[PDB]
Design a protein around this ligand. Sequence first.
Ligand code: NDP
Ligand code: 52V
Length: 157
Amino acid sequence: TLSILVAHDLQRVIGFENQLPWHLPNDLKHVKKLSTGHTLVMGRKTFESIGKPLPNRRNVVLTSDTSFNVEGVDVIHSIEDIYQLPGHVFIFGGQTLYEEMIDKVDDMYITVIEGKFRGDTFFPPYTFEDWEVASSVEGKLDEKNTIPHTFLHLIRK
Ligand SMILES: NC(=O)C1=CN([C@@H]2O[C@H](COP(=O)(O)OP(=O)(O)OC[C@H]3O[C@@H](n4cnc5c(N)ncnc54)[C@H](OP(=O)(O)O)[C@@H]3O)[C@@H](O)[C@H]2O)C=CC1
Ligand SMILES: COc1cc(-c2c(C)cccc2C)cc([C@H](C)C#Cc2c(C)nc(N)nc2N)c1
């Protein structure tokens, strides 16, 4: 099973200066709950923006660097290698990996951030004519989660 996992804004910004433009604990809980016990595939820059694997799932970094080695991270050097990973595999960023994979994934788990942020990286455009809305759940606003947001599960038609 091949899924996208992404948070994107009203204009499909996903990032700014190798960071997320927003901080939204609800989305981080969402990510952890979806991906615990499973597999995260991410591009090198996305991984390096964090510096350490997320516990309790397989962390897989795609890079052309043959010297790349981090404790608790598995490395792949080709897109083709993704299709050999067992279980539920989540494409986890960044822009380059989304662009490479969006036509290949079965479904997408998208947090729509209902804001317009300054960004330098983007999710690829897509149309709902290719995707069914399996579910659409509004996130609760509070003092810790102050941007409106929607959890979408889309499945390729
Ligand atoms: N809003 C969100 O849900 C998320 C946002 N982000 C954001 O995205 C941004 C980073 O995105 P982006 O700049 O596109 O970088 P990526 O994280 O996608 O990394 C790009 C790198 O991935 C490696 N790579 C990609 N494709 C291949 C391939 N086919 N073969 C071998 N290696 C490959 C290369 O590594 P190398 O150069 O070492 O060869 C490449 O330079 C940051 O702003 C981050 O915060 C990231 C995830 C989620
Ligand atoms: C192990 O490498 C990473 C770890 C984290 C990370 C998480 C998910 C929770 C707590 C702490 C950390 C460091 C994040 C990322 C990237 C930036 C991403 C992402 C992302 C987010 C935030 N939301 C939705 N919906 N999709 C996403 N792909 C990479």
